[PDB]
């Protein structure tokens, strides 16, 4: 909803402008915007496309570019560590949550998927969480299987018109 | 009944007689040129009503008669069907000598009225002997062929009609003499020894609309049938054996190619168009039927 | 049926004698609904008195199911056999007058029976006696009923079904719109093909120019 | 004329049933004589209406509409690809330089 509206906002302010060199805080909503919407190539080339002044100008594109970096190598427990180790500027701030709300969904979405027997060590680095944390949530939840052995068991449990259109078309 | 046309439709010009074009296509002789020339032969309604009474109103004995009409372009329309007085054994007729008398005296009497077709072919009714022209209708039809050119042998089988509950209407022409040109044997075995000499026709029907309107209100308990037609169902193998025709059609077509991908288009737009019939009959019923007090 | 010849011969009594008939009606087999019996004056003035238990057993025949019936044990007077087989062959009809796929764990349920084959055989009995037809199923535990008699209804319920059918009848009336409207459009797509058609006509006009060149 | 034979066999069902439902509702009113039992087999036509609304049924209705929509996918390519084949034969003729 509100990050379509922003992603449109952005581009329009890229598109037409006048003064031709963007304020770093614009760049760097667009970092953390591309970033949300989990699009690396487009994140990338705008990281590419940013001049070095610029870069230089403040350490908030340094640390979402860190950010990005880490998200690249898939290394989730890294995501984690750096969604949180630094701080950021205001205009930035309600979407990086929303930010480390959809990397969470989609952990627990790829742990869901591609697992059926998996350490409960393994699950707590996926989440970024304190074991028995997880292991609560996820006795509440129900995808889960038992202690001791330390393995979590993640499962996953007008066509008038259309055909008349297509025959009128085929009688020719 | 409303919300269309009521004057004369575009299935009644098949009605029409025109003498002058026949007149034309008669002086013309087109038929001589390319001898595998009639391929369609379109039967009225009322002439295959009467042919079939006919022929199951005879028994297990033969009989036959003549069929009125006239030719177009590639197509031989018969539109009524006159029996004839003769006395026929179990296996062959003869038509001695009441018979031509009748012939003459029944053309007169339908021009006095008003019918202005001429005579276009002959008929004759196998009991239960299968639908194929035997040593005797051959002799006979090339005779008819050899001077009243325009002619077509129709068959029909009335026990077999009548057991099984489908017409078996044959409409075949004769080659002249001299004129040689897992898969079942039955394209030779059905038919006789003469199977070289003469070859079949695509046999369709037709009717006015004042015919389909009157058929229309014909009865008023065959809507069951229609509403649980079940359709797609029990013409499964049809649908299969024209698909494996189709590609048959398909293959021939692109071997040629490399105007026989028309008719190869056609069959794959018929063959659609049923299914496509058959979908949007199941789709009507479960809207009718299923989606109530859910 | 059988209820008018009941209903004829217990025209012209009353008293007790009206109670015995109604116990022998509730005990005659092949009787499954008593609809025209309810309406007779000597039934109905039967609720004053201290007979009143008689009238009660006979709705609940008429229009309650076995559940009901359990539900006032005590009030109502003891049953025999029959009448208890008869009420749970109308409770397997009530229920699968509502759903045509009925569970096993609900039928043991309601008819309050404990072993399967007491249950497959009362079934078997009921599609017996031809109230209801179906198949049973213990892959899946069910029972799958294809046709099943119409109970009694009351007077006042009518309506409702009347709204049922009032339903269905817009339904058809939709579904025949549709209908129309599809055909209009198909005939326009024709009638604007042979309008292109038309344009090639205008194609020999073209023709008629390299007569003169 | 496919759907000509549907919307009759519809209304001439439609016609049934309002004249049914006209019935009832006459019986409902008490302008006529109650009968006990066209009203009871009334309520046994009315309470079968959903017929066969089991998931095996939803299963098989969707394989035959996939089946029919691949029948129709298979049957269009053919016929715009003799299109295509006329397209072509009249650009290699009158656009082509012999």
């Known amino acids: 909803?509100?990050?379509?509206?922003?992603?449109?906002?952005?581009?329009?302010?890229?598109?037409?402008?006048?003064?031709?060199?963007?304020?770093?805080?614009?760049?760097?909503?667009?970092?953390?915007?591309?970033?949300?919407?989990?699009?690396?190539?487009?994140?990338?080339?705008?990281?590419?496309?940013?001049?070095?002044?610029?870069?230089?100008?403040?350490?908030?594109?340094?640390?979402?570019?860190?950010?990005?970096?880490?998200?690249?190598?898939?290394?989730?427990?890294?995501?984690?560590?750096?969604?949180?180790?630094?701080?950021?500027?205001?205009?930035?701030?309600?979407?990086?949550?929303?930010?480390?709300?959809?990397?969470?969904?989609?952990?627990?979405?790829?742990?869901?998927?591609?697992?059926?027997?998996?350490?409960?060590?393994?699950?707590?680095?996926?989440?970024?969480?304190?074991?028995?944390?997880?292991?609560?949530?996820?006795?509440?939840?129900?995808?889960?299987?038992?202690?001791?052995?330390?393995?979590?068991?993640?499962?996953k449990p007008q066509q008038l018109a259309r055909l008349t259109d297509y025959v009128a078309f085929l009688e020719n | 009944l409303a919300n269309n046309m009521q004057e004369a439709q575009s299935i009644d010009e098949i009605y029409k007689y025109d003498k002058k074009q026949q007149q034309e296509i008669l002086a013309a002789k087109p038929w001589t040129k390319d001898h595998h020339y009639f391929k369609y032969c379109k039967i009225s309604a009322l002439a295959l009503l009467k042919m079939v009474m006919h022929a199951r109103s005879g028994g297990n004995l033969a009989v036959m008669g003549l069929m009125l009409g006239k030719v177009d372009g590639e197509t031989m329309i018969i539109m009524d069907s006159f029996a004839l007085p003769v006395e026929g054994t179990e296996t062959r007729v003869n038509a001695q000598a009441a018979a031509y008398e009748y012939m003459a005296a029944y053309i007169e009497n339908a021009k006095q009225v008003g019918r202005l077709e001429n005579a276009i072919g002959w008929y004759h009714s196998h009991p239960g002997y299968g639908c194929w022209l035997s040593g005797i209708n051959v002799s006979t039809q090339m005779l008819n062929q050899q001077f009243q050119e325009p002619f077509v042998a129709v068959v029909i089988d009335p026990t077999r009609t009548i057991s099984a509950?489908?017409?078996?209407?044959?409409?075949?022409?004769?080659?002249?003499?001299?004129?040689?040109?897992?898969?079942?044997?039955?394209?030779?075995?059905?038919?006789?020894?003469?199977?070289?000499?003469?070859?079949?026709?695509?046999?369709?029907?037709?009717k006015s609309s004042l015919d389909r309107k009157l058929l229309e209100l014909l009865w008023n308990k065959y809507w069951v049938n229609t509403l649980s037609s079940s359709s797609l169902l029990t013409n499964a193998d049809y649908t299969t054996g024209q698909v494996f025709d189709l590609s048959e059609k398909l293959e021939q077509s692109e071997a040629q190619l490399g105007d026989k991908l028309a008719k190869a288009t056609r069959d794959s737009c018929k063959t659609t168009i049923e299914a496509i019939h058959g979908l949007m009959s199941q789709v009507i019923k479960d809207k009718l039927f299923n989606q109530i007090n859910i | 049926?059988?209820?008018?010849?009941?209903?004829?011969?217990?025209?012209?009594?009353?008293?007790?004698?009206?109670?015995?008939?109604?116990?022998?009606?509730?005990?005659?087999?092949?009787?499954?609904?008593?609809?025209?019996?309810?309406?007779?004056?000597?039934?109905?003035?039967?609720?004053?008195?201290?007979?009143?238990?008689?009238?009660?057993?006979?709705?609940?025949?008429?229009?309650?199911?076995?559940?009901?019936?359990?539900?006032?044990?005590?009030?109502?007077?003891?049953?025999?056999?029959?009448?208890?087989?008869?009420?749970?062959?109308?409770?397997?009809?009530?229920?699968?007058?509502?759903?045509?796929?009925?569970?096993?764990?609900?039928?043991?349920?309601?008819?309050?029976?404990?072993?399967?084959?007491?249950?497959?055989?009362?079934?078997?009995?009921?599609?017996?006696?031809?109230?209801?037809?179906?198949?049973?199923?213990?892959?899946?535990?069910?029972?799958?009923?294809?046709?099943?008699?119409?109970?009694?209804?009351?007077?006042?319920?009518?309506?409702?079904?009347?709204?049922?059918?009032?339903?269905?009848?817009?339904?058809?009336?939709?579904?025949?719109?549709?209908?129309?409207?599809?055909?209009?459009?198909?005939?326009?797509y024709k009638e604007n093909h042979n309008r292109t058609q038309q344009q090639v006509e205008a194609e020999v006009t073209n023709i008629k120019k390299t007569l003169k060149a | 004329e496919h759907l000509i034979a549907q919307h009759s066999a519809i209304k001439m069902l439609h016609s049934r049933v309002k004249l049914i439902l006209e019935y009832v509702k006459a019986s409902e009113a008490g302008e006529v004589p109650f009968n006990h039992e066209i009203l009871r087999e009334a309520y046994a036509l009315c309470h079968c209406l959903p017929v066969l609304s089991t998931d095996k049924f939803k299963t098989d209705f969707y394989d035959q509409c996939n089946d029919v929509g691949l029948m129709a996918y298979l049957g269009t390519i053919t016929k715009t690809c003799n299109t295509m084949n006329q397209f072509v034969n009249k650009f290699n003729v009158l656009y082509d330089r012999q």
């Not at chain 1, 805080?25 to 080339?45: E, I, K």
């Not at chain 1, 997880?134 to 393995?151: C, F, H, N, P, Y």
């Not at chain 3, 009995?125 to 109970?151: H, M, P, S, W």
Request: glycine share 6%.
């Open chain 1, 1 to 155: 909803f509100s990050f379509k509206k922003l992603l449109d906002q952005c581009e329009n302010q890229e598109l037409e402008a006048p003064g031709g060199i963007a304020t770093p805080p614009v760049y760097g909503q667009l970092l953390a915007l591309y970033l949300l919407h989990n699009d690396m190539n487009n994140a990338r080339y705008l990281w590419k496309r940013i001049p070095p002044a610029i870069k230089s100008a403040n350490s908030e594109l340094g640390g979402i570019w860190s950010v990005g970096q880490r998200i690249w190598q898939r290394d989730f427990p890294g995501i984690y560590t750096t969604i949180n180790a630094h701080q950021w500027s205001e205009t930035v701030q309600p979407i990086m949550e929303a930010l480390r709300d959809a990397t969470r969904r989609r952990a627990f979405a790829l742990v869901s998927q591609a697992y059926t027997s998996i350490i409960a060590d393994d699950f707590a680095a996926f989440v970024g969480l304190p074991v028995e944390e997880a292991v609560k949530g996820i006795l509440e939840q129900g995808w889960q299987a038992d202690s001791t052995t330390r393995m979590v068991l993640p499962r």
């Open chain 2, 165 to 206: 509950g489908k017409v078996n209407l044959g409409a075949f022409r004769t080659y002249p003499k001299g004129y040689k040109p897992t898969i079942p044997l039955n394209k030779i075995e059905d038919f006789g020894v003469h199977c070289k000499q003469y070859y079949a026709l695509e046999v369709s029907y037709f």
């Open chain 3, 1 to 188: 049926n059988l209820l008018e010849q009941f209903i004829l011969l217990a025209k012209g009594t009353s008293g007790s004698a009206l109670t015995a008939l109604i116990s022998q009606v509730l005990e005659a087999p092949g009787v499954y609904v008593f609809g025209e019996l309810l309406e007779l004056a000597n039934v109905q003035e039967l609720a004053e008195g201290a007979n009143a238990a008689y009238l009660q057993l006979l709705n609940l025949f008429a229009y309650g199911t076995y559940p009901d019936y359990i539900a006032n044990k005590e009030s109502l007077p003891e049953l025999s056999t029959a009448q208890q087989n008869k009420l749970k062959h109308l409770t397997i009809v009530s229920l699968a007058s509502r759903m045509k796929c009925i569970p096993y764990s609900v039928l043991l349920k309601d008819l309050e029976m404990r072993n399967l084959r007491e249950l497959e055989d009362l079934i078997i009995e009921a599609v017996y006696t031809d109230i209801i037809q179906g198949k049973l199923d213990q892959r899946n535990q069910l029972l799958e009923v294809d046709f099943c008699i119409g109970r009694d209804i009351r007077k006042k319920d009518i309506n409702n079904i009347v709204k049922t059918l009032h339903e269905w009848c817009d339904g058809c009336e939709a579904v025949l719109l549709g209908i129309e409207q599809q055909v209009l459009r198909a005939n326009q």
